[PDB]
Amino acid sequence: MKEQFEQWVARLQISEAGQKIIEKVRSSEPSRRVGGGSKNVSGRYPSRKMGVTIQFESHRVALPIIYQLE
DNA sequence: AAAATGTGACTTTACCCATAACTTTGCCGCAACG
């Protein structure tokens, strides 16, 4: 899981700052919890690619992008 | 930090259908005048 990541970074030759920010993203939990607001349907989707739940704040402008990325 | 869910069982006007009930009105006779 980590050796493949390192080889991917080496192949793309990502700078130290970029790899650091990527590791911070892949380690840190989401910054804010999704709130429904007032006109947005919010919620969770099971991403089998990652294998975890992903939060979306809109089911007709952001969720379809999630399906595409899955 | 943020766009996308009204809905359906219940009740109510509206038109048609059949019949009762009073008023219309042409088709006929009958009395009166020319």
Tokens representing residue A25 in the block = 């993203």
Minimum CA–C1' distance nucleotide for A37: B2
Question: What's the resolution in A?
Answer: 3.7
Residue with tokens 């399906």: A67
Alpha helices in chain A (DSSP H): 2-12, 16-27, 63-69
Count CB atoms within 10 A of the CB of residue A42: 16
CA of A18 to C1' of B14 (A): 75
The technique is cryo-EM
In Å, what is the CA distance from A31 to each residue of A27, A53, A65? 12, 15, 20
CA distance A21 to A57: 24
Q: Does an H or E element contain A52, and which?
A: strand A52-56
CA A48 to chain centre: 12
A6, A12 contact by CB (below 8 A): no
A57: CB within 7 A of chain B nucleic strand: yes
- Known binding positions of A for Mg(2+): 57
